[PDB]
Amino acid sequence: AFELSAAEREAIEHEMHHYEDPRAASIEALKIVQKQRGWVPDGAIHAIADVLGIPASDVEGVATFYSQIFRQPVGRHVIRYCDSVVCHINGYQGIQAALEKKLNIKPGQTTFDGRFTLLPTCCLGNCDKGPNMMIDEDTHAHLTPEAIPELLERYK
């Protein structure tokens, strides 16, 4: 069902060259598969385990330990709004309410068209410019609930 692409295999092996032990490339191998396919499916655990020479239980433990390695299907874009305390003071709840009322989903859910998945993340290290959001790779700061219906429509 799952077979690693050639570019994924070369990227994983190149990451394995960087470390004394090949086990140390597990996080980056999972991130490589996730970057190529949106998330890490079930067969990717065994494929990465075979490439790295570690058990599949270790790969699954690493993949389910880290929050940013997705072991369930996500949408085309992952919205990650900050949940922590400075953005709580700066009013992240209005941003979360605006995102929920636009996308008609709860946090942790994906829209019916597969465009967005909404997730609360921890502090994005941008607390002096809060509240903060992270759509796929872009960090959007100084958020207002009125700017959500324009920010979300530039991610097709």
Added chain:
Amino acid sequence: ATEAGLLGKNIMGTGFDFELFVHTGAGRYICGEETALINSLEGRRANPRSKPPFPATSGAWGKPTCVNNVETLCNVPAILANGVEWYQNISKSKDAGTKLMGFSGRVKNPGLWELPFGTTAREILEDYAGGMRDGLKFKAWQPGGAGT
């Protein structure tokens, strides 16, 4: 720095070999704890380790390992370019050198400024952060992040 000979093999003709990698994380707050950092570096779950042994004797892959913050290593080059006496003669406090300090959260100017140790929190909040915003009364503060 590698193309300029500052990294790699035979740095500045001294024979010292140093290779610098950038390992991007996958999002856990416990990964910053140094022994859990070492465990995540080794491709494991980021559980911390009991000390002793400290990572200086048995760290990453059982080798001598030193974990330091970004800002400590950024303090190092000024120390070695200007001297010990200069680093000890910029603040009359028991904590030597300068520190990045800053106020955040519903102040006029939330931000980050490099200040000597012994700078009071009031002068940071008023002179640098601009005081609290309009129509807001100061009721509490955390000095050093969410764990203080």
Added chain:
Amino acid sequence: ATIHVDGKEYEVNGADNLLEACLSLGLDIPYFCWHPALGSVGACRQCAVKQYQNAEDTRGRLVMSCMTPASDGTFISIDDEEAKQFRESVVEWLMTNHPHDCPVCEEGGNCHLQDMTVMTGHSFRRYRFTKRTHRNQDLGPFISHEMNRCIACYRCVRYYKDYADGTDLGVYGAHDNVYFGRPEDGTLESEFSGNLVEICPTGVFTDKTHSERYNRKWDMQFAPSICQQCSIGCNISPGERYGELRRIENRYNGTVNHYFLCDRGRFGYGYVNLKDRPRQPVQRRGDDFITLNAEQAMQGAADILRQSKKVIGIGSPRASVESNFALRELVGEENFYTGIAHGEQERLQLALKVLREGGIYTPALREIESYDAVLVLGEDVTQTGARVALAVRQAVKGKAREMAAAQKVADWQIAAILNIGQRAKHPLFVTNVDDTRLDDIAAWTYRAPVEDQARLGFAIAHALDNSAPAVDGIEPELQSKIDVIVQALAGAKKPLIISGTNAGSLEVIQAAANVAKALKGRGADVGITMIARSVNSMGLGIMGGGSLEEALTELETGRADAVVVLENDLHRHASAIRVNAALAKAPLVMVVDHQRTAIMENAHLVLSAASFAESDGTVINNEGRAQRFFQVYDPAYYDSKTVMLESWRWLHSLHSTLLSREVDWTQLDHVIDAVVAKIPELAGIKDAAPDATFRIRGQKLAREPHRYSGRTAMRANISVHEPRQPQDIDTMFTFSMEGNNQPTAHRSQVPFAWAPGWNSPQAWNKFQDEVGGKLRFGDPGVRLFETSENGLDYFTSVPARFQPQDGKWRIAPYYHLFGSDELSQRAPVFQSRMPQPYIKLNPADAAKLGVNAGTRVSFSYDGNTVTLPVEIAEGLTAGQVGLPMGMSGIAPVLAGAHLEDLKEA
């Protein structure tokens, strides 16, 4: 070292942690994540004590006793109020999410979490919010999974992965949703997965085989017994209820199998509860099967035996020493035959000669873990002697232990040791006809036919010692690997040479003996281990006798017209056609057995012998250790018409009826005295266990716990009148609660571990001199022979290399932990776990035959054409064909034999 616990002065070992030091002193500290065999990690935070800086300190500090060295001049308090409050708080935090499951949980009354909940005195719930829940996984036929009951103590993963080197169990997830299981549903693949049910302090991992016929630990009738499923002789506690064998628990033995069994021994007891077992003596007259009682069975058998001219007896390596000896006395020494084939007997007595005349110390199973280099020659140890493979894994991790000891890291601090010794390990070189389960930790694996394995052993011996015979025709690459092995073995302080009789090759055993002798001549502390085939293979070899072919010849020639077969099916050691013809020729066949075998159709008389659960006896280890097993239950307590006697009792009463025409149901100690009087090599079996007159301050040893229930009800459907308690004249155990099972009683045989406040397998702490050490008054069992003063000579019979000849196919043996051993593969829970019958082929030979993977091929062996589907074996060599030994129809005497007319069916 001097410690002060609650102001009381104690002398401890300074290299221990405070938790194990205090548990060894009899103090109680609650704990979850620590185990004596796994080391200390400091996870559960339960074992907190209060440490003071000196005697004049009152504040103190809460420390973890498992992570704190018990150094000289230590001051701690267990009964400190703040420490007690913290320990109760830890139990409370574990209780917040714990399911309301104790009545419907197989761990109840045997649960360590229950014990530590009560011990901290936490009985009031003030948590009012929701409990987290978990879905369960299917872990196969042996282990049941209930992740709700988990306390995240991490014992399971640390055992299964860092101790047993299993790969398919792990921890997943995060903060409070931490999950312990497989990455997906499926059978747990470790051969030692069954130890999870005792390692797990809660009811997450439970014995599914016990769960089918569940009963609580107080309702169990236990006895100390020896596992019958291979030669390693791990001590077990079988427990019964309502006349059926319910469970096999690990019985602690700090010299043999301390905390762990393999899965074959733990789950292969199901043959004892088979409904087709003989329960009465049955005589075949024409087509009629008359049921007899004991007395008239002996009278009729003695009459027919008296009228016959020659009577021969065929023993078995399944039977105890007493049963084989009683048969040998009934038929005479000259008419007694061991039930194994001639090649098996040759290999067994050669291994015995190496063990008791080779001058090289043979280690116990626990001592195997301390060796510095291992060479396994010809033995599939994981499939034939599995607990030795687990001990070999510990010996391999010894290098990381030494590396961490070099950095002054304490030996209980397991995580630091494993971090220091990352992938470094002691050298392991395994040799087999194919890949083994030890190949993950093996420095090198040699896949070759048994002649080439023997030649590699002979070459290693010659390279170590030039006086050893040389091998001609070694390839340069194989020579380089030989020098790798020789440099590893010569550089070790304690090399260990493992071989055995299961390879089917005498030359492999000879090569192993040559390597051990060469290492001994260089001044090394070399040990040698020989893995036998069955529970009493070494005892049957020590007693000796003719081979099965000689007995069949005596039956076929008509010189013997009566044969008494003891606990032997005769088809695993000879061809079924020849055995059936020889037994049909004999006018009197008497089979004494506890299982329904195929030769009972030809049997004129069948005596319902007892299995190990219903009998007492002595079995000899693969290391020569004589161990007594004790009867668990009386089979006639529930079924009054059951006549299921011990085999030695049957044969002794038959001998008495043959001589003096009166029966004599003897005693076990009389038979043991007869053994030690008649066979001086077996004289050590007298000291294996004390005799039936042994008492603890005048009272016997109790087989069942003090809270054993249902005394006036368990038999009330049969009759409301309570029957007499079954008397035990053979042993020092009583069939009741009216006895002793104190942890401080001066004895070595402990039927089960229980102490007040310790209802779990953690109660074994109270029965040991120090935790994880020996039993307090010595582990049971005695070594029959000491190490010889002088060794053997070198075996100069170096074989030629294997040559694939056309038309003939050398049978390569494949052993399975589930399937090869006879009695355990008769157990019904093993059939799902048993591999399907697959004949293994090289890709080249399969392409030569025009056969793909899965197509069925037919071959004729001894005139019997059988058909099996093909599995392609990459690691096998050409000209060899792989067959699963011990399965249905594939007798283990096929190892090393040749095959003809292999063609697609």
